Amino acid sequence: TLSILVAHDLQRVIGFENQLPWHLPNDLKHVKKLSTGHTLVMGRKTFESIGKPLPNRRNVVLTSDTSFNVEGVDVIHSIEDIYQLPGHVFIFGGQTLFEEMIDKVDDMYITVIEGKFRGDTFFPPYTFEDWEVASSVEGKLDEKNTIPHTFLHLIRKKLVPR
Ligand SMILES: NC(=O)c1ccc[n+]([C@@H]2O[C@H](COP(=O)([O-])OP(=O)(O)OC[C@H]3O[C@@H](n4cnc5c(N)ncnc54)[C@H](OP(=O)(O)O)[C@@H]3O)[C@@H](O)[C@H]2O)c1
Ligand SMILES: COc1cc(Cc2cnc(N)nc2N)cc(/C=C/C(=O)N2N=Cc3ccccc3[C@@H]2c2cc(C)cc(C)c2)c1OC
């Protein structure tokens, strides 16, 4: 399976100055539970923002840098390399990789951050006419998680005659 994994706000903001605009620990635990034991594919800028690979999963970084080499990170240099990765592959970001892959993935795990943040990077527009809501689960709010959010699992709809 090839999946998108993303958090975006009410206006599809995903980042500001190479950081998540929001502080929401519950969504990082969501990311952890979905992607442990599988593969994350991310662009170079997204990797440098995190700074080190996330433990207990394959970390794949897409870059044009022939010199790129980080311990615990596998490097690919073209989009076509993604389809050769085994197992469940999650497209992890950022805007550039999302734009290149949104028309190719089987499904999307989207955390909708129910707010309006200042951003400089965005998830591409998409329509629920094209995507079936396999599940929609409201995140629970508490002391450390104060922004309403919704976990969506969207599966691409099949085009059928009538
Ligand atoms: N909210 C979320 O769920 C989420 C998730 C991830 C990231 N983000 C945010 O997204 C922002 C970064 O997005 P971004 O688009 O600016 O950067 P990005 O997609 O993370 O990285 C872009 C880089 O990836 C490499 N790349 C992309 N496509 C390629 C291709 N076809 N072939 C070879 N290399 C390729 C290039 O690296 P080189 O220039 O080294 O060749 C390119 O400069 C950050 O603010 C981050 O916080 C948000
Ligand atoms: C730009 O910056 C980033 C972007 C994204 C992309 C992304 C965010 N959300 C959605 N929904 N989709 C997305 N593709 C992720 C991250 C997160 C990286 C991070 O440190 N952990 N993540 C998972 C993890 C797994 C195992 C051990 C440690 C972690 C760690 C973490 C886990 C837990 C349980 C709590 C905390 C506080 C951290 C990121 O760094 C801020």
- Residue 64 main-chain phi, psi, to 5 deg: -85, -5
Closest atom of ligand 1 relative to the 79 alpha carbon? 31
Is 62 assigned to a binding site?
Answer: yes
Locate the domains of the chain by residue range.
1-162
Question: Quick one: resolution in A?
Answer: 2.0
At 77, give phi and psi (nearest 5°).
-120, 0
Q: Could you give the CA distance from residue 48 to residue 60 in angstroms, rounded to a whole number? A: 12
Question: How remote is the CA of residue 107 from the centroid of ligand 2, in Å?
Answer: 20
| DSSP state, residue 88 | -
Residue 138 tokens read as: 């409201």
Half-sphere exposure of 89 (CA within 13 A, CB side): 19
Q: Which is nearest to 41 in space by CA: 87, 76, 1? A: 76
Alpha-carbon span 144 to 128, nearest angstrom = 31
Q: How were these coordinates obtained?
A: X-ray
Tell which one of 22, 95, 104 to mutate to probe ligand 1, the residue whose CB is within 8 A of the most ligand atoms. Answer: 95
Classify domain 1-162 at the CATH topology level: Dihydrofolate Reductase, subunit A (3.40.430)
Contact indicator for 149, 26 with CB cutoff of 8 Å: yes
Q: Are 119 and 14 within 8 A, CB to CB?
A: yes
Enumerate the H helices of the chain as residue ranges.
Answer: 25-35, 44-50, 95-101
